[PDB]
Design a protein around this nucleic acid. Structure first.
Ligand code: ZN
Ligand code: ZN
Ligand code: ZN
Ligand code: ZN
Lengths: 103, 66
DNA sequence: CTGACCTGAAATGACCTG
DNA sequence: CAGGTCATTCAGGTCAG
């Protein structure tokens, strides 16, 4: 763990099974969550360079690179699992009623 | 540890093992589900790589006796 | 839209109990 | 060394720039 396997920037640990930076992590998550890939279209031949500086220049090449290295699209929670998580966190915040139950 | 590379906290269940593979196996069979390797049960279980694959680590547990 | 930074569940693995 | 703790160590959401 140290450098992002997709663009070479500093990484923040494992994300979707790969050592990546917050940049590639966020991009991947949002592409899967909103199914944005189909609209991604390289404007040349899919050979664009993806490095810590050029990563935002071609969305399709950046996503095809995330797939190639092995980022797990299945670790991006579907709507039922995402909503269940928010539900859990919100209702857990019921520590409030207990705080006031102490005294 | 007969599983990873880490030292053994003595014997547990089916063999001498670390508290990592100990806790891991302690939890596994209790709240049990079914791990599934993302690869091909090749995942080398060692100190620095043990948490990467729960399939291989679990099979590795019962494999070496546990 | 991006990504540096955040919140908190959940898993791991240290360290005690008898 | 079966037994429990339970402080510590990767998801989705946020919003300025
Ligand atoms: Zn990156
Ligand atoms: Zn391109
Ligand atoms: Zn071990
Ligand atoms: Zn495996």
């Amino acid at each position: 763990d140290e450098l992002c396997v997709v663009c070479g920037d500093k990484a923040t640990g494992y994300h979707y099974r790969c050592i990546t930076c917050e940049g590639c992590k966020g991009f991947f998550r949002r592409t899967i969550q909103k199914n944005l890939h189909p609209s991604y279209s390289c404007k040349y031949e899919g050979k664009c360079v993806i490095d810590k500086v050029t990563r935002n220049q071609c969305q399709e090449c950046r996503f095809k690179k995330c797939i190639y290295v092995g980022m797990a699209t299945d670790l991006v929670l579907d709507d039922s699992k995402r909503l269940a998580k928010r539900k859990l966190i919100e209702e857990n915040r019921e520590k409030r009623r207990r705080e006031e139950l102490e005294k | 540890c007969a599983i990873c590379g880490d030292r053994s906290s003595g014997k547990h269940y089916g063999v001498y093992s670390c508290e990592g593979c100990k806790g891991f196996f302690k939890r596994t069979v209790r709240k049990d589900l079914t791990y599934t390797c993302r690869d091909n049960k090749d995942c080398l279980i060692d100190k620095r790589q043990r948490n990467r694959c729960q399939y291989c680590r679990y099979q590795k547990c019962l494999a070496m006796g546990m």
